């Protein structure tokens, strides 16, 4: 995946307050790092199908948290789409 | 004193290298029209001796049938394998309505007024045992209040 | 070669009188048990004498 110093870096910007990892927008950002890391691996390795349902599962766990985040505050959802580029 | 009643006699032969066999078996229902009924089977070759083999075999297993008078206490379904009878209480002037084998196990205890229908399978061995197993699991109003700890008027 | 047939037994606590009883009920010349009061492993055996001997291990 990604290294811990890469992983601990990306939980600094989207953190809401100190020692609050596990927040929805701090575990969507680390997914979007892991999404973009593995389909770059999968771009040059097109035959790796067992790693593809690892991608397709964590696509699903990112979508279920974006759909969760709209249900309690919409204005936080609009900020995350602008901060890191997602469609929809 | 007991009241004998047959259900059916069967003509069964097991294949032998020489001459085949002549076993005539029969199941009977034995009751006293007061709340105590048992069944049993008997295998012999002399047919009136094959009956009395099944009558004495019924004598070792008599089940006490609880009763609010002229009917059964509550609504049950008996189960034994595939046979399954239904048993609804009735008014005391309806007449006991039942099938072939289940009428004999219902007349031999004194009820004479209940709704019934033999669901499931059909063979007379199983539905007479799936009725006894139904009548095994009946409860009076007075003995439940002994277990539950209330009185007969507190249950209502 | 010589093949020694093993007879497995599970060690159990009892009186010496009990060990004599159980040994006779099998006719075995050796019975090994843990002594009920001493707690140690004991072997009751029949000597070449015909009398009993008791070994503590």
């Amino acid at each position: 995946a990604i290294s811990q110093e890469r992983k601990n870096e990306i939980i600094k910007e989207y953190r809401v307050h100190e020692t609050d990892t596990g927040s929805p927008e701090v575990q969507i950002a680390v997914l979007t790092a892991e999404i973009n890391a593995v389909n770059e691996h999968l771009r040059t390795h097109k035959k790796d199908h067992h790693s593809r349902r690892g991608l397709l599962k964590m696509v699903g766990r990112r979508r279920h948290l974006l759909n969760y985040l709209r249900s309690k505050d919409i204005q936080r959802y609009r900020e995350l789409i602008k901060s890191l580029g997602i469609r929809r | 004193e007991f009241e004998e009643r047959v259900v059916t006699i069967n003509r069964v032969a097991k294949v032998v290298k020489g001459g085949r066999r002549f076993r005539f078996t029969a199941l009977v229902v034995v009751g006293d029209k007061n709340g105590r009924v048992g069944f049993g089977t008997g295998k012999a070759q002399e047919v009136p001796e094959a009956i009395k083999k099944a009558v004495e075999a019924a004598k070792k297993d008599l089940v006490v049938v609880p009763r609010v008078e002229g009917t059964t206490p509550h609504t049950i379904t008996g189960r034994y394998g595939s046979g399954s009878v239904f048993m609804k209480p009735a008014a005391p002037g309806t007449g006991v309505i039942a099938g072939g084998p289940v009428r004999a196990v219902l007349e031999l205890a004194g009820i004479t007024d209940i709704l019934s229908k033999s669901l499931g399978s059909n063979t007379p061995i199983n539905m007479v045992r799936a009725t006894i197993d139904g009548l095994q699991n009946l409860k009076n109003a007075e003995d439940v209040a002994k277990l539950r700890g209330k009185t007969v008027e507190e249950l209502y | 070669i010589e093949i020694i047939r093993s007879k497995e037994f599970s060690l159990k606590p009892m009186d010496s009188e009990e060990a004599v009883l159980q040994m006779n009920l099998l006719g075995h010349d050796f019975f090994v048990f843990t002594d009920r009061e001493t707690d140690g492993t004991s072997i009751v055996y029949r000597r070449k004498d015909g009398k009993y001997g008791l070994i503590q291990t």
């Binding site: - | 206490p73 509550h74 409860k139 277990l147 539950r148 700890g149 209330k150 | -």
Partner: protein
């Protein structure tokens, strides 16, 4: 992700009854507490106990058995359920086992027994059959 709480309560009670257990504990609720409170008032269990823990405090049941090693609750059936909720008016509010067993019913007064719903003339969601 168990999807019916007070049916999971009701089969804990049946499975403990089958093996002659006399003591089990539940992840409790209000309706779990007050169904278990209504079985001791009708007299199926011996005594329910306290609710203590920080999250969803447990409670213990103490089943009650006959003196000839018989069991009191013989059969226990959840009738209303998710997907098909059954509701009963007070007119056709049914007697269980020809009036022998009971039927605890959630009405708009808190849940009450089979007896206590007709003379109160209220109906509601009929929860289960206890016999």
């Amino acid at each position: 992700t168990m999807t019916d709480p007070i049916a999971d309560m009701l089969t804990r009670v049946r499975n403990a009854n089958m093996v002659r257990h006399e003591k089990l504990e539940l992840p409790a609720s209000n309706i779990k507490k007050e169904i278990a409170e209504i079985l001791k008032s009708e007299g199926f269990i011996k005594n329910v106990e306290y609710v203590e823990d920080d999250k969803q405090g447990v409670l213990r049941l103490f089943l009650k058995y006959g003196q000839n090693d018989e069991r009191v609750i013989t059969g226990l059936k959840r009738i209303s359920k998710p997907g098909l909720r059954v509701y009963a008016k007070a007119s056709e509010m049914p007697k269980v086992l020809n009036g022998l067993g009971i039927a605890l019913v959630s009405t708009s007064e808190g849940v009450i027994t089979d007896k206590e719903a007709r003379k109160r003339n209220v109906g509601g969601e009929i929860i289960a059959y206890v016999w």
